[PDB]
Ligand binder design. Sequence first.
Ligand code: YM9
Ligand code: ZN
Length: 348
Amino acid sequence: ASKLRAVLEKLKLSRDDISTAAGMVKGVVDHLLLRLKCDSAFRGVGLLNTGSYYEHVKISAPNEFDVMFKLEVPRIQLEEYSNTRAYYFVKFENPLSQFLEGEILSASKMLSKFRKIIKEEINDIKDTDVIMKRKRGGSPAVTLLISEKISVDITLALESKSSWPASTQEGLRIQNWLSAKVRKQLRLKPFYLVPKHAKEETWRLSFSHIEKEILNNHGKSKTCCENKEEKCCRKDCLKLMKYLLEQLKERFKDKKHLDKFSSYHVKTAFFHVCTQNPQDSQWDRKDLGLCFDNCVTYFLQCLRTEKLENYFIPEFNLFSSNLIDKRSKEFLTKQIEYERNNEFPVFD
Ligand SMILES: Cc1cc(Cl)c(-c2cc(C(=O)O)c3[nH]cnc3c2)cc1F
Ligand SMILES: [Zn+2]
């Protein structure tokens, strides 16, 4: 578990060292929020987690940021599209009615207005060089580039404060780890709807905001990582799994076999290992190597079986053959199998 500690030490340095990046990013985001709020359709706009203007998907490249803009949408009426469990039609004074196509709220008609208002606030910036990207990928809707290295992903999201949709009833299976009372509390928090297709004007249910709630209070014991006698490697295992996929995606960026894989799959699988191993002793720091291996083993089992269920929506398979093909899965299975059987070269 010595090599892994060095990977983690190098990773701590690029994070902790004086980086102006996030400040160039805040300035941009603040300008857009002041602009969007002036508009009748985008008045109730705000950053998802205000104060922390990021969600660093890239653990290797600290120049690549990801930001979410929430829109508080009251009296939301959802209709599950094609029994998908994760994709819904948004139905419902008239506050957002300019995007309505009868009963159903249009995501594309909202994203186009969002893209255009952002295009109009870009030109007005005199401080730093910011350039937009109109590449098709649904959401992230807008992919800005501040200066030359810094890239920002902006996602528009609908916020609903009503109880979570039925499809989430069996999800968040944290009871035997974080408790039945913590599960009840988190389920009391809002949920989001981000624009995304299943092939249609649909919205995908998002619970990315619950991650920080869990990572900063991840033990079965209330004092996990608060003392010397209670240090676990849950966070370290998440960082290493995230970096392993990242180094592999970079190693094979010329090919297209790893393009569908994201840190989201790595996170989902890691949290399913937390459910499997609910005790703090199954996550002892001394056992960083063994622990990381249960994560590496669980992820390989996911690829092989073509099964990685959404952590909040059990009936939605992120590894569905209709989402990711067997060829893409078999390629990654072989690349990781090589990494574990070669003392993780990708890290050194
Ligand atoms: C325990 C736990 C596990 C996971 Cl996987 C997530 C989570 C969820 C979504 C999502 O869209 O629903 C994410 N989208 C990008 N990163 C994401 C992370 C949140 C959690 F609280
Ligand atoms: Zn801990």
